[PDB]
Paper text:
Antigenically sequence variable M proteins of the major bacterial pathogen Streptococcus pyogenes (Strep A) are responsible for recruiting human C4b-binding protein (C4BP) to the bacterial surface, which enables Strep A to evade destruction by the immune system. M proteins form parallel, dimeric α-helical coiled coils which are attached to the bacterial cell wall and extend ∼500 Å into the extracellular space.
The structure of the complex between M87N100 and C4BPα1-2 was determined by molecular replacement to 2.7 Å resolution limit. The two M87 helices (aa 46–110 and 46–125) were asymmetric, with one less coiled than the other. The interface was dominated by negatively charged M protein amino acids interacting with positively charged C4BP ones, supplemented with a few hydrophobic contacts. The C4BPα2 quadrilateral as a whole was not involved in interaction, except for R64, which formed hydrophobic contacts using its aliphatic chain with M87 Y81 of the major helix and a salt bridge with D80 of the minor helix; Y81 was the only core a or d position amino acid involved in contacts. In contrast to the C4BPα2 quadrilateral, the C4BPα1 Arg39 nook had the same role as previously observed in the M2 pattern, forming hydrophobic contacts and a salt bridge to M protein. Here, the former was to M87 W92 of the major helix and the latter to D96 of the minor helix. Relative to WT M87 protein, Y81A, E89A, and D96A bound C4BP ∼21-fold less well on average, which indicated that the hydrophobic contact to C4BP R64 and polar contacts to K63 and R39, respectively, were crucial. With LL-37, the two M87 α-helices splay apart and no longer form a coiled coil in order to accommodate α-helical LL-37, which inserts between the two M87 helices, whereas with C4BP, the two M87 α-helices formed a coiled coil.
Residue numbers in the entry:
A (entry chain B): 1 to 18, 21 to 68, 70 to 74, 76 to 90, 92, 98 to 122
B (entry chain C): 46 to 125
C (entry chain D): 46 to 110
D (entry chain A): 0 to 16, 20 to 124
Write the structure that this text describes.
């Protein structure tokens, strides 16, 4: 018998609120805002040994590509939670964040 | 002589920088192509799952249609 | 082992080629990120069609058992 | 009120291996080697106007980036997709050992480069 499911950073339960669980229980999960389904199923399963089996079935959504006239350093990537460093009027940085059923940049481009 | 050493040291540090800027752009281009390939391969597999589901749907509606048609026939037969 | 003047003259040249390479690497990464935006869009459109199919599949199976 | 033989498609092939077709006739297709599915509807359907209705449900597969050529350059003339060709070159003072060109071809249910990266050697 399984205990509470682990806390995933990319998904939350889809039809239950957060106890113990019978073997063979299959909880359906949904990708958190800012993530997209990367596997055909999105489930956590209680195995015969009382543990939860699952892989990573969501991945970061990616913002669109950021040109600054008279002046953009992508330090990592364009994925959810990443930051770009912007010549000097405006913001010096922008982050990929959740923006209305999708992702987007926190601030638009600055004025050089 | 002292100026030449100072010039070489400056440009060596300059070339060391530009080598890192390219190396970081190279890895960023490599990771951006692997990530495309990740989705492209997942989609090719996911369409297979889509097709198996559509086949199930076609079979389901077929079994359902044959069931109501047989039920209507027996009810019409009983009425005769 | 080279002379300081000789080494600096080739480091200067190499810096020129690296600047040109980086400028090119940034057009290719731009086109790559734009490509990924498209393939990710194609993935979201798949889950839209797939979800419609599964809702229909679930309703079909419910009327049979 | 009837469709003629279906058009030949450059990106897909008919799944079935008749000359007149009734309105509503649906023929299923699959993508050609070097192509990949881009839509859910891989079918041609006979429309009431006597014409086959279909979109382009297949697009080119894409070869991965060849890699950086030591002491040389890799010229991506067009793109990295099926059918496209890249050219190789070595820097001044280096000799090219191998192929100068490579094509994105079909390689085992996928795509790959015909020739590997050459060696630029002094
Ligand atoms: K579609």
């Amino acid at each position: 018998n399984c205990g509470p499911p682990p806390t995933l950073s990319f998904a939350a339960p889809m039809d239950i609120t957060l106890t113990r669980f019978k073997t063979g229980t299959t909880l359906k999960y949904t990708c958190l805002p800012g993530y997209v389904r990367s596997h055909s199923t999105q489930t956590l399963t209680c195995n015969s040994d009382g543990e939860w089996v699952y892989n990573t079935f969501c991945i970061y959504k990616r913002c669109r590509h950021p040109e600054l006239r008279n002046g953009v350093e992508i330090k990592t990537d364009l994925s959810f939670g990443s930051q770009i460093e912007f010549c000097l009027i405006g913001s010096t940085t922008s982050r990929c964040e959740v923006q209305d059923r999708g992702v987007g940049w926190s601030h638009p481009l600055p004025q050089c | 002589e002292v100026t030449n050493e100072l010039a070489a040291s400056v440009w060596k540090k300059k070339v060391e920088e530009a080598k890192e800027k390219a190396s970081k752009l190279e890895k960023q281009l490599e990771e951006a192509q692997k990530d495309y390939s990740e989705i492209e391969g997942k989609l090719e597999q996911f369409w297979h799952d889509y097709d198996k589901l559509e086949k199930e749907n076609k079979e389901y509606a077929s079994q359902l249609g044959k069931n109501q048609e047989e039920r209507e026939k027996l009810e019409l037969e009983y009425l005769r």
